[PDB]
Design a protein around this ligand. Structure first.
Ligand SMILES: Nc1ncnc2c1ncn2[C@@H]1O[C@H](COP(=O)(O)OP(=O)(O)NP(=O)(O)O)[C@@H](O)[C@H]1O
Length: 280
């Protein structure tokens, strides 16, 4: 699929840099015709088929195709797409309140209610995605951005669809590996992947939200991955002594090696606690 090939600078002015990633940079921008603000994600194209630099057109088109499908309060939407010889430029909904990662770093200690308030929104966004058979495959605090960080209960949106896939045959078998700290055992073991992998990542996020500590993190990537595959985590009393047993139950039912035995997104919403890159 081709995209708009007019110069994006004819239509937008850019400002502050918002973040960067695998061959991408994201800049705050303003559309000239409306004064409305967006996040422009400049993704570097591959210069040759066999190149390892830049993102393949197949991978760019998948991200764009998935983004075009989604409209939900807890996910980022796509406004427009431009391209030129070197970049595909995705004009995305702006999320101005920073990463959940940075929010957690600055505050250092959430209550169960604060954690649940974030987690419920994450679960709602993932419920929408999974209802559409979209696996995100890179859920982590860096990929959950706050609308406004200066309210008591910040609203969030899931970002970064660079690894997301449609799962129309229950599982996908590639070619898919997220951040070691957050990937499921099936990712570590290069097994077929489905929506269940996101549920594992939600378990890891929940553990971090409640404790400020990462359940599987070793001193090297290989150690983290070995820990993940072995389900080598525990609830440290120093961090969890005043955390409810129900919260621990929720995490325990997500951090399960066999993807078939793991809670689904629907299970997670009915759970009594809730119900009202890989190489060194
Ligand atoms: N819609 C948005 N609003 C505000 N900031 C954003 C938005 N999208 C991305 N960012 C920031 O830009 C960073 C990189 O964007 P992302 O979409 O994760 O690119 P990426 O190349 O897939 N990263 P990686 O997963 O490391 O390869 C994010 O971590 C955010 O800090």
């Amino acid at each position: 699929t081709v995209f708009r090939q007019e110069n994006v600078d004819d239509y937008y002015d850019t400002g502050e840099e918002l973040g960067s990633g695998v061959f991408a940079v994201v800049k705050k921008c303003r559309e000239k015709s409306t004064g409305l603000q967006y996040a422009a994600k400049f993704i570097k194209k591959r210069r040759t088929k066999s190149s390892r630099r830049g993102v393949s057109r197949e991978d760019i088109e998948r991200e764009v195709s998935i983004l075009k499908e989604i409209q939900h309060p807890n996910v980022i939407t796509l406004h427009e797409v431009y391209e030129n010889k070197t970049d595909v430029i995705l004009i995305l909904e702006l999320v101005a309140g920073g990463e959940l990662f940075d929010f957690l770093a600055e505050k250092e200690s959430l209550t169960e209610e604060e954690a649940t308030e974030f987690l419920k929104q994450i679960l709602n966004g993932v419920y929408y995605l999974h209802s559409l058979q979209i696996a995100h495959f890179d859920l982590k605090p860096e990929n959950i951005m706050l609308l406004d960080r200066n309210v008591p209960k910040p609203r969030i949106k899931i970002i970064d669809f660079g690894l997301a896939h449609k799962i129309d045959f229950g599982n996908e078998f590639k070619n898919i590996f997220g951040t070691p700290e957050f990937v499921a055992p099936e990712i570590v073991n290069y097994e077929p992947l489905g929506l269940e992998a996101d549920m594992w990542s939600i378990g890891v996020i929940t553990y971090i939200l409640l404790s400020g500590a990462s359940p599987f993190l070793g001193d090297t990537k290989q150690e983290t991955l070995a820990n993940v595959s072995a389900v080598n985590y525990e609830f440290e009393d120093e961090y969890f002594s005043n955390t409810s047993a129900l919260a621990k139950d929720f995490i325990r039912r997500l951090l399960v090696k066999d993807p078939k035995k793991r809670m689904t997104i629907q299970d997670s919403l009915q759970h009594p606690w809730i119900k009202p890159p890989q190489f060194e």
